[PDB]
Amino acid sequence: MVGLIWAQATSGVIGRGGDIPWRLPEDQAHFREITMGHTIVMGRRTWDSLPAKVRPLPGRRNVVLSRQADFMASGAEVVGSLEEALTSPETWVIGGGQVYALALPYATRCEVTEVDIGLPREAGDALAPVLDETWRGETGEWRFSRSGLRYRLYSYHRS
Ligand SMILES: NC(=O)c1ccc[n+]([C@@H]2O[C@H](COP(=O)([O-])OP(=O)(O)OC[C@H]3O[C@@H](n4cnc5c(N)ncnc54)[C@H](OP(=O)(O)O)[C@@H]3O)[C@@H](O)[C@H]2O)c1
Numbered sequence: 001m002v003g004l005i006w007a008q009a010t011s012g013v014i015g016r017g018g019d020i021p022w023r024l025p026e027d028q029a030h031f032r033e034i035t036m037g038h039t040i041v042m043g044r045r046t047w048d049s050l051p052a053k054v055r056p057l058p059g060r061r062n063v064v065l066s067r068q069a070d071f072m073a074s075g076a077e078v079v080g081s082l083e084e085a086l087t088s089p090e091t092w093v094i095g096g097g098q099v100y101a102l103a104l105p106y107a108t109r110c111e112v113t114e115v116d117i118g119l120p121r122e123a124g125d126a127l128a129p130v131l132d133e134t135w136r137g138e139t140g141e142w143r144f145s146r147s148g149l150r151y152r153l154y155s156y157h158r159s
């Protein structure tokens, strides 16, 4: 089973200049829970946005998409096609915008957390994929973070 997990603003933005433009500690403990134990696929630019410390993410098989045939990620498997990356039964694609859009044609699940911030879509932004009518989803209640931000959780499934 192949799924995608991302945090977005209402507009669709997920990253900006190598970073996520917010701080949602509760999502860290939610993201860690859903991915812990399995394989995680990220693109190279996303693998680079992680602090050296938490690189690689403990307890998980870190897989990095890249076209650089020489690119070495200390502690992660470097492949060159997502077909190469997608080999484990339960795999979670964790970013970024380029990888999310490449993987969705092949996911049965999506774990979305939407942050309530008024964040305009600047050119060159990393965006969240778009889900059509083929996606039946469940929504949770709006919650309120130790950061001071309202957010709600979305789970989608494709039969
Ligand atoms: N929850 C969130 O809000 C969230 C989650 C994760 C990341 N982000 C943000 O997302 C942003 C970056 O995402 P991005 O979309 O700009 O870059 P990305 O998707 O993170 O990875 C981009 C890299 O993936 C590799 N790649 C792309 N297509 C490929 C293919 N078909 N085969 C092999 N390798 C391929 C390339 O690496 P080479 O150039 O090495 O080939 C490309 O440079 C950052 O700002 C990050 O913080 C946010």
Ligand SMILES: O=C(CCc1c[nH]c2ccccc12)Nc1c(C(=O)O)cnn1-c1ccccc1
Pocket: 005, 006, 007, 027, 028, 029, 031, 032, 046, 050, 051, 054, 057, 058, 094, 095
């Ligand atoms: O906090 C998160 C989640 C943030 C996040 C949401 N979607 C993502 C997609 C790709 C990469 C990270 C995210 N992960 C973890 C962990 C963990 O998962 O165990 C440990 N440290 N960190 C961390 C701490 C500070 C800054 C960054 C990462």
Ligand SMILES: [Co+2]
Pocket: 033, 034, 035, 036, 037, 038
């Ligand atoms: Co699990």
Ligand SMILES: [Co+2]
Pocket: 108, 157, 158, 159
């Ligand atoms: Co199903």
